Amino acid sequence: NLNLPEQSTRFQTIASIHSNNCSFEILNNDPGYIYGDSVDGECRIAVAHRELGNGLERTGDDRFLFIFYALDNNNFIIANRHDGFVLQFLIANGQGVIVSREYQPNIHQEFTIQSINSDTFRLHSRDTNTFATVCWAQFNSWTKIVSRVDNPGAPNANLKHRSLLTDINMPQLPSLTPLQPLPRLTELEDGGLSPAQAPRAIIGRTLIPCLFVNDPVLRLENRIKQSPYYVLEHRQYWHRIWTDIFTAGERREYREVTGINNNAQNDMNKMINITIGADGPNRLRFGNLSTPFRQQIIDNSNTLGSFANTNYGTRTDIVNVFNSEFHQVRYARFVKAYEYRLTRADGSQVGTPWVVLDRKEMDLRTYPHNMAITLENVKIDNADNSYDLSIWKTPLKLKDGKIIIENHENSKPYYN
Amino acid sequence: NLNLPEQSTRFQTIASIHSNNCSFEILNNDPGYIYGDSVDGECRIAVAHRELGNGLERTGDDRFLFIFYALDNNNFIIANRHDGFVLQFLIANGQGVIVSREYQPNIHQEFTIQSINSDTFRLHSRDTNTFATVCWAQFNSWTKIVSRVDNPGAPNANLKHRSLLTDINMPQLPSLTPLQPLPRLTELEDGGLSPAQAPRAIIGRTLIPCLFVNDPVLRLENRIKQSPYYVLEHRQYWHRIWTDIFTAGERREYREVTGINNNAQNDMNKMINITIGADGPNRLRFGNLSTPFRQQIIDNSNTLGSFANTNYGTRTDIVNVFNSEFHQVRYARFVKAYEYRLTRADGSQVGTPWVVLDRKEMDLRTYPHNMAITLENVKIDNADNSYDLSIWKTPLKLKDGKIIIENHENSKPYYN
């Protein structure tokens, strides 16, 4: 069940309803370029780089094919299939024109659709109150696309789609699956599921427009053709941090490294202009490129907005554990992992997934069953930041199969 | 499965971290009101109606309890449990103050949470770059709440929640259910399921903040206590428009009224500041009150944004049907209905649901089974607008159990 307008899930041509054969066409022209068919005046001479033409439509020519990326504010970014540049309103020489530019974004790249009736619409420019149409109503002539205010005698701004491309390599979204409880251990030699073997739950997934995905292999002109959307998956799994056999009354010390490394955060930011905020493993910080889509990304990925000024980092805790059972016992200790994975439309992975180990949510598996180890002491060895310096209140019994989540009753600041 | 920040699903008090016992308090004061404890100057005298006080916190006093309604843009509207008024930044006498006002909304009612660490935050008015705190840092004194720019001398603006109310009458959201196919008819006297008996599918459901729900029985001061959110359900069902027994070769004429009446749209607009656009039965138009939440409402209700400048209206079609079967046959004719229902947190219905009859999606049930009636002629008798003036291409066989959806092959403009 995809909650998108039909303009966002296909490519379409854009034409005046008053043109027999002509549609909006991406040009790579310079100022001074002459539109041969045009009557003399402002419509004959190009005044900007990459104006749009009113060109004879060729079936399956990418210069005429546009996709409408839906923003949270009900406006659209309109990208072409030839080079992935977007439409932009621009004033040059006091003439309002439509050009194509790289996604910035800016308010002049945002367009409203106004439907007049079932098959007729207008393209409205945000904040200028102008509508896209053909220069001086030359609907069957080679000339530029302008954006002008409604006046009596202004060129009719009623548009239609002339042709569609529906075979566009839309991704197939994976099904949501719940996080399964870890299996019980079967003997003393059973270390439990390693991180590579642990099943992933798919908690959420969202489409990401290709415009701001810095795919290291596919340039924009190829992304718009083969992967106009990418898929961001929000996955969870139980991440084993250690396992050992303890004799009766055995004590041990472990270094527990949790969170997410600064290099992984920088990679995520470069790739999709999103990082994980320090306020939680499911809390997203958006940059200028991703911000206009933030509520769709949150709603579909089942994440939350971050309120933090700082990125989630790493923390090293030194834990002292004591086997107070009068038995030889296999203990396996797990924290909850949040795994963010980016795929192309063809399902290929773009890089290494971004993983946050959440120290605040933990589970244990034992053999024999229903055993308990005691967390006697926790010390912060180091942290990348001072956002969260809470530790477990000790002593704390960790029992086979019991999930423990940090709250104000079971934790305290490190110096207390 | 509720995708909201914890601040949005509870009430909380707001206090300076530097105050022993004091928290932000809703006042109904006027200019000239004296704050007795305050040092003389701008902090002693109220300069606006409904300033906020730095008051001694009383457990379960609604004047100290605030809920944070999450906007699509990651800002919050902050409402109090006493009277449902919201916080607003205001300049009076060149002093930046926090007041309480009725939800408008305006940009001065929008606040950002800036988290410094796990339990500390600041309240930012983004367009002014001011932060809420206690007048002249009088953190343990009766005085007003101000909003000031960061300067060396400026009162520390670090805040915390002192107390929580988590028992707030959050609604229980119904499960999603699919649209079931209509049962087969069992005999000639079986007219099929009437609209009152037809099972509803729940296609989507969303929380609506009580602030702009004009509940005809609950005033704002009671809504914020008993139903801080309302539930909007998007339901679908098969709506019977007529049923009759036809003899062999019998002809009949029906007036089919479809769409939604102007009075139902006005009621929906008054109640929740939303209407159904003419571009489809699942296409929502938002007014000034609902707009800041539009993407959340769309994503959760599984509707789409409308691009139309006009509301969905009614259309009356005159249909001529012919039983070309050599049998006495019971025919029952259905169109797909979209039903929008509003409930309080306790599950009670707020008024009559808003129904769109979609003439573009239709089904038939017959007895005996696998019979077909012929749609011989369709005429538009009248329509509220000219948005959709398509009719069925005739003759068109309607067969038992076969759903027909309008497309460019099976329909045409009324004059052709």
Residue numbers in the entry:
A (entry chain B), B (entry chain A): 49 to 464
Q: Which sentences did the original study use to describe this structure?
A:
Diffraction data were also collected following mixing with pH 3 buffer. In total, 466,741 diffraction patterns were collected from which 279,362 could be indexed in space group P212121, (a ~ 79.89; b ~ 82.84; c ~ 157.88 Å; α = β = γ = 90, highlighting an increase in unit-cell dimensions in comparison to the pH 7 dataset). Manual building and refinement from the ensembled diffraction data led to a model with Rwork/Rfree of 0.189/0.213 at 1.78 Å. Similar changes in the structure were seen following a decrease in pH from 7 to 3, although this is not physiologically relevant to pH values found in the target insect guts. Briefly, mixing at pH 3 results in a larger increase in overall binding energy at the eight crystal contacts (5.0 kcal mol−1) in comparison to mixing at pH 11 (1.8 kcal mol−1), suggesting that crystals may dissolve more readily at low pH.
The Cry48Aa/Tpp49Aa pair is produced by a number of L. sphaericus strains and is composed of Cry48Aa, a 135-kDa protein belonging to the 3-domain family of Crystal (Cry) proteins, and Tpp49Aa, a 53 kDa protein belonging to the family of Toxin_10 pesticidal proteins (Tpp). Mosquito toxicity bioassays have revealed that both components in combination are required for activity against Culex quinquefasciatus larvae. Within each Tpp49Aa1 monomer, two distinct domains exist: an N-terminal lectin-like head domain covering residues 49–214 and a C-terminal putative pore-forming domain (PFD) covering residues 215–464. The final model of Tpp49Aa1 revealed the presence of a homodimer forming an “X” structure with a large intermolecular interface, similar to that described for natural heterodimeric crystals of Tpp1Aa2/Tpp2Aa2.
